[PDB]
């Protein structure tokens, strides 16, 4: 019995392919801010996809860019989770 050599990876990208990823110069990247916030509260309770989905929503809803350049003003972001996991992951 064998297992695929590509199995059991997960990639949590801050943004979707082709897209910019936003960073506040004073507070840090949107994605890391959200990820740490969610982990701090739920990291030992929830499954990894639950955590990362909550991160997706936090980034999607709580953040919007500000710029005096109209081209960069009021932009949004969604992260992108790629799962090749074969089981549920709790940090228990």
């Amino acid at each position: 019995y064998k297992i695929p050599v590509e199995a059991d990876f997960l990639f949590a990208y801050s943004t979707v392919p082709g897209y910019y990823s936003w960073r506040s110069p004073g507070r840090g990247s949107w994605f890391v801010q959200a990820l740490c916030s969610i982990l701090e509260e739920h990291g030992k309770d929830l499954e990894i996809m639950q955590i990362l989905t909550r991160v997706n929503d936090r980034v999607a809803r709580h953040f919007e860019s500000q710029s005096d350049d109209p081209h960069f003003h009021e932009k949004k972001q969604i992260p992108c989770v790629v799962s090749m996991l074969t089981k549920e992951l709790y940090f228990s």
Binding site: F9, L10, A12, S14, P17, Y19, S21, Q33, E40
Partner: protein, 143 residues
């Protein structure tokens, strides 16, 4: 939570978490300082340590340094660890991340951990968190 469907976490240690924190870049890359990244690195250090990881942070790594660190990590003995994590904080473009001196394909970094190349992490989760642009498109959003 039915145990047959969860990764086994009954190991001596949760595992290693490597953070690559790239803030300053060589003038040749034409890439600017990533202000705010240190706050990211310190936040991530605290929250990944809280989970049970042995977190280790490396700053302003060249492409060669990133490659050698991950390669080294893949060659260490993870027998008594439940999983492995790596966090990349840098500039990026589609499929690549910036080292201090240029771009390296993200797939080259993750390749060391392939099941046939990293036996002590076989059947264990290998997690990569990637904070980097993947292109220049912007999402205008919708109300």
């Amino acid at each position: 939570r039915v145990p047959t469907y969860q990764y086994n976490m009954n190991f001596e240690k949760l595992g290693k978490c490597i953070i690559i924190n790239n803030k300053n870049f060589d003038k040749v890359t034409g890439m600017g300082v990533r202000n705010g990244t240190d706050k990211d690195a310190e936040a991530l250090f605290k929250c990944f340590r809280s989970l049970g990881f042995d977190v280790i942070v490396y700053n302003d790594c060249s492409c060669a340094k990133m490659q050698d660190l991950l390669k080294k990590a893949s060659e260490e003995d993870h027998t008594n660890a439940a999983c492995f994590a790596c966090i990349l904080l840098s500039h990026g473009e589609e499929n690549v991340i910036y080292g201090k001196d240029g771009v390296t394909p993200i797939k080259d970094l993750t390749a060391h951990f392939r099941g046939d190349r990293c036996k002590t992490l076989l059947e264990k989760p290998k997690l990569f968190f990637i904070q980097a642009c993947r292109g220049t498109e912007l999402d205008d959003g919708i109300q």
